[PDB]
Amino acid sequence: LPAHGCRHVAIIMDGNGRWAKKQGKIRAFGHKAGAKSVRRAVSFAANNGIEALTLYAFSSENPAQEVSALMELFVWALDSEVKSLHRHNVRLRIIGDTSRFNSRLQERIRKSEALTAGNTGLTLNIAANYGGRWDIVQGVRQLAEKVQQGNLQPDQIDEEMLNQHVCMHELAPVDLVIRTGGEHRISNFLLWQIAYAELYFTDVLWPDFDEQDFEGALNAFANRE
Amino acid sequence: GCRHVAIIMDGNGRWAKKQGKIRAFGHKAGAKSVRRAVSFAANNGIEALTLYAFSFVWALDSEVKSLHRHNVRLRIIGDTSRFNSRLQERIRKSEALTAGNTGLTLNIAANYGGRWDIVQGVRQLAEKVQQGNLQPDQIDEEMLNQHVCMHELAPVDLVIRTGGEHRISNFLLWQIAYAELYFTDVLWPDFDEQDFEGALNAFANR
Ligand SMILES: Cc1ccc(Oc2ccc(NC(=O)c3ccccc3C(=O)O)cc2)cc1C
CB burial of residue B150 (10 Å; 0-12, 13-18, 19+): buried
8 A C-beta contact, residue A94 and residue A167: no
Q: How far is CA B38 from CA A97, A130, A191, B44, B136, in A?
A: 41, 37, 28, 10, 41
Q: Count other Cβ atoms within 10 Å, centred on residue B192.
A: 13
The closest of A106, A64, A55 to A85, measured between CA atoms, is A55
CA dihedral (B187, B189, B193, B197) in degrees, to 10, reads: 30
A67 CB under 6 A from ligand 1?
yes
Counting from 1 in the atom list of ligand 1, the atom nearest the Cα of A94 is: 27
User: What are the backbone angles phi and psi of residue A51, rounded to the nearest 5°?
Assistant: -75, -40
Counting from 1 in the atom list of ligand 1, the atom nearest the Cα of A82 is: 1
Amino acid, res. B196: F
Question: How would you classify the pairing of strands A91-95 and A8-13?
Answer: unpaired
A-interface mutation test, from B167, B174, B203, most A Cβ less than 10 A away: B167
What letter would DSSP give residue B110? S
Distance CA B156, CA B168 (A): 14
The closest of A50, A68, A48, A49 to A59, measured between CA atoms, is A68
B-interface mutation test, from A186, A187, A225, most B Cβ less than 10 A away: A186
What letter would DSSP give residue A90? P
User: What are the backbone angles phi and psi of residue B152, rounded to the nearest 5°?
Assistant: -80, -5
- The residue of chain B with its CA nearest to that of A163 is B115
* A198 labeled part of a ligand binding site: yes
Distance CA A21, CA A15 (A): 10
* Domains in chain A: ranges and CATH: 1-225 (3.40.1180.10)
Question: What residue's CA is closest to ligand 1, atom 15?
Answer: A71
User: What is the A127 CA–ligand 1 centroid distance (Å)?
Assistant: 6
- CA triple B115-B108-B169, angle to 5 deg: 35
Distance CA B150, CA B118 (A): 12
The answer to whether the CB atoms of B139 and A134 lie below 8 A apart is no
Q: Is the dihedral angle over the CA atoms A25, A26, A30, A32 positive or is it negative? A: negative
Counting from 1 in the atom list of ligand 1, the atom nearest the Cα of A66 is: 18
Distance CA A82, CA A90 (A): 9
What letter would DSSP give residue B132? T
Give kind and range of the element (H or E) at residue B105: strand B105-109
CB contacts < 8 A (A, B)? 114
Distance CA B8, CA B169 (A): 9
Side-chain-side CA neighbours of residue B174 (13 Å): 25
User: What is the A6 CA–ligand 1 centroid distance (Å)?
Assistant: 24
Q: How far is B107 from chain A (nearest CA, A)?
A: 20
User: What are the backbone angles phi and psi of residue B127, rounded to the nearest 5°?
Assistant: -55, -45
Distance CA A171, CA A6 (A): 13
Distance CA A69, CA A47 (A): 32
User: What is the A188 CA–ligand 1 centroid distance (Å)?
Assistant: 15
Altogether, the residues listed in chain B come to a count of: 206
8 A C-beta contact, residue B57 and residue B91: yes
Residues of A in contact with B183 (CB under 8 A): 199
Helices (H), chain A: 16-22, 27-47, 64-87, 103-116, 132-148, 159-163, 211-224
* Residues of A known to be catalytic: 14, 62
A162 CB under 6 A from ligand 1?
no
8 A C-beta contact, residue B41 and residue B50: no
8 A C-beta contact, residue B77 and residue B112: yes
The helix/strand/coil state of A177 is: strand
CA dihedral (B125, B126, B129, B134) in degrees, to 10, reads: 20
Distance CA B202, CA B205 (A): 5
Rg (Cα) of chain B, in Å, rounded?
Answer: 18
